[PDB]
């Protein structure tokens, strides 16, 4: 960025100094935050096993070591969602169990957690023509189940008791 000779700082977003000019040497340097991100944990049932896999949100798998130790590079497979630790990549594709994101899914299979691309479903091709039809010759009656909530628990809370429980002075301040 080409600062004007009378310009010192730079604020493209109007609340943080994007770039500054060093006084000793008039060259200008741009400021970038130190990176961050949330930490999420992949896990099967607690009583199923104890192995877990951690996911860092939207960070290159280069700053994760210098970021519960990482313990060097051991299957540091990188995805669009972020850095995935503790799971092997699988070329096979199955249905989803734990949706991690961006077409990726993980599940516990008998290194205990595998991650795979989303498998959409069974493929099938229709034997189409212009003079062929299909008609069932038998049937089958099936029964399914659906559940729908109707009402929530009917609750009411007192006003003064919660706020200023049995205090005259607190009530007087409240009014």
């Amino acid at each position: 960025k080409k600062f004007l000779p009378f310009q010192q700082f730079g604020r493209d977003i109007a609340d943080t100094t994007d770039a500054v000019r060093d006084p000793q040497t008039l060259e200008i340097l741009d400021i970038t935050p130190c990176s961050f991100g949330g930490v999420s944990v992949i896990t099967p049932g607690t009583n199923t096993s104890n192995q877990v896999a951690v996911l860092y949100q939207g960070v290159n798998c280069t700053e994760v070591p210098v970021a519960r130790v990482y313990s060097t590079g051991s299957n540091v497979f990188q995805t669009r969602a972020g850095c995935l630790i503790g799971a092997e990549h699988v070329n096979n594709s199955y249905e989803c169990d734990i949706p991690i994101g961006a077409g990726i899914c993980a599940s516990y299979q008998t290194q205990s957690i595998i991650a795979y691309t989303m498998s959409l479903g069974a493929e099938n091709s229709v034997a189409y023509s212009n003079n062929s039809i299909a008609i069932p010759t038998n049937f089958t009656i099936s029964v399914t189940t659906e559940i729908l909530p109707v009402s929530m628990t009917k609750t009411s809370v007192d006003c003064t008791m919660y706020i200023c429980g049995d205090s005259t002075e607190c009530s007087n301040l409240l009014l």
Partner: nanobody, 114 residues
Framework: QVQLQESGGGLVQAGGSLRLSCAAS????????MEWYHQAPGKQRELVAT???????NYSDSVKGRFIISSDNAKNSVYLQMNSLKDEDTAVYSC????????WGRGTQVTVSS
């Protein structure tokens, strides 16, 4: 650094004595599980000996009587002494550890001359 490095492999005639020694940078004690894996050529990997955190020790059927797994708490490592070596014991040995994610080491190709 290699979080777990193995040493002791090499060639040896049948019936000799050998001590596989793989050492890990991290404390061998919070790791909760040490194990050794060797795979014969043309064969699948198999477990050799396991030692849990509590101290329970188990050996494979072709391992009892000769191979004993140990771990001295002076230099953090695990020890595995081989003796009365026989030719099908020739394989690529690797020691396995699992604190909350699998760890693996390389090397230690043992050959038994017969």
């Amino acid at each position: 650094q290699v979080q777990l490095q193995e040493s002791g492999g090499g060639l040896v005639q049948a019936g000799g004595s050998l001590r596989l020694s793989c050492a890990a940078s991290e404390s061998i004690f919070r790791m909760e599980l040490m194990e050794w894996y060797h795979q014969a050529p043309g064969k699948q990997r198999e477990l050799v000996a396991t030692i849990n955190r509590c101290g329970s020790t188990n050996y494979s059927d072709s391992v009892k009587g000769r191979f004993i797994i140990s771990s001295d708490n002076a230099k953090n490592s695990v020890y595995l002494q081989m003796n009365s070596l026989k030719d099908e014991d020739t394989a690529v040995y690797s020691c396995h550890a699992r604190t909350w994610t699998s760890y693996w080491g390389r090397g230690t190709q043992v050959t038994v001359s017969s």
